[PDB]
């Protein structure tokens, strides 16, 4: 069924165990990706999940309800296409983008960058950024991780939701 294109909540909030992150979405550049992320949030799909992979000065990765890094699914019934733009580049911290497993394999997993990551340009859909809470994101990026880059203490998304 998928929400109508008219539904464009400007924000998605992540209430994490370390505080709230306010994301703002790039609806014009990445309409399908924004719809997916906002709708999964609205459904509660991300509630009680964790950032399963964090690498200092790189990014924080989450969005897999199994927590394995292997799972997650979109609202489209299949993995969906990239929405790439040369003029949206990984120029700094706070950028919201899709994790994937190759071209046009978007599901539910996403990441927020901790620094510039331009080697990812053209390979991951950029679909928003942090408007408020970058200080939190910066701190989350520093958490101790194991040899698999999994945080040793869970960093949970307690709740996620779009603007009402």
């Amino acid at each position: 069924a998928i929400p109508p294109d008219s539904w464009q909540p400007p924000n998605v909030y992540l209430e994490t165990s370390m505080g709230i992150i306010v994301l703002e979405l790039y609806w014009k550049h990445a309409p399908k990706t924004c719809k997916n992320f906002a709708e999964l949030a609205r459904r509660g799909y991300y509630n009680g999940t964790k950032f399963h992979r964090i690498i200092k000065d790189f990014m924080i990765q989450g969005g897999d309800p199994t927590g394995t890094g292997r799972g997650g699914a979109s609202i489209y019934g299949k993995q969906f296409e990239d929405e790439l733009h040369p003029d949206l580049k990984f120029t700094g911290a706070g950028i919201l983008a899709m994790a994937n497993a190759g071209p046009d394999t978007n599901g539910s997993q996403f990441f927020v960058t901790l620094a510039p990551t331009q080697w990812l340009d053209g390979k991951h859909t950029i679909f928003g950024r942090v408007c408020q809470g970058i200080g939190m994101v910066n701190r989350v990026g520093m958490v101790e991780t194991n040899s698999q880059d999994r945080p040793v203490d869970d960093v949970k998304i307690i709740k996620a939701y779009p603007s009402g």
Binding site: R53, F58, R70, A99, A101, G107, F111, W119, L120
Partner: peptide
């Protein structure tokens, strides 16, 4: 290394 994958994580 520095990827953000989903299934086969690389160095």
């Amino acid at each position: 290394x520095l990827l953000v994958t989903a299934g086969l994580v690389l160095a």
